C-alpha cells in the first residue's frame, strides 16, 4: 500500500522496488504527483528519478536510510524536467553518483536544472550504450526516441515485471498526453510503442503521473499520441 513518510508516498510494487511519490502545486491543476522508483540491488540501492526539490528528494534519500538502510550506488533520471532532476543537488551533497541521457545533460542548465555527472548515449536500435551504464545491475535503460521530450528515456527492471515510462506514458484512462511544450509531435506515438515493444513482457507499466497501470495504457498512450501527428 501506500506508505507516508513525510510529505512523500512510498508504495512497494515488488519484494526489491518501491515507488516513490513527491507533490507540487501547479496552477490550474492543484498538487501534482510524480512518481520515481528506488530499487535494492543485493547491498546496494538504485534510484530511478529524484522528486520535484531537493528536500523532497533528501526525504527519499532518508526513507531509504530507514527502511533500507545500504548505500545508494547511482541515480538514474529520465529527463531534464523539475520532476525528474529537480532534487539533482540533493543527490550529490550525499556523494551519489548520477546518470542521465547525455541531451538531458546538455538541456540541464538551459531548464534551470542542475546536470547529472554522468551521461548515457544509445545504440541505433534505442538500448542504452553498456560501456556508459556501469553497475547499473538489473536496471535495462531505453531510448525509445523523441516524445514528451527530445531527451525522454525508459527503464525495465530485469527480474520484475515492472518496466517505467516516465513521462512518455500515461495510464489507459487518461485524458491527454499532459505537458507537451517540449514534445516532439511527430515521433512521440512510435516512440511510446517502442518502449512497449522494448520490454515486451513487462505487465506493470509504471508512470510518472498516474499508478501502475496494464499495458493497456501504452496502446492508449500511442493512441492520444496518433493525434499529434
Ligand atoms: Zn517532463
Ligand atoms: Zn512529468
Redo the contacts with the bound molecule.
Sequence with gaps: GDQRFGDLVFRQLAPNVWQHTSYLDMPGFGAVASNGLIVRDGGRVLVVDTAWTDDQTAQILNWIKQEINLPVALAVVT?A?Q??MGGMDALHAAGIATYANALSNQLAPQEGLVAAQHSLTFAANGWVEPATAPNFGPLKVFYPGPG??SDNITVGIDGTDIAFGG?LIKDSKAKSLG?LGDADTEHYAASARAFGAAFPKASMIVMSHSAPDSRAAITHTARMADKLR
Design positions: 529527463h524536467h520532476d525528474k514528451h521530450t513521462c505537458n
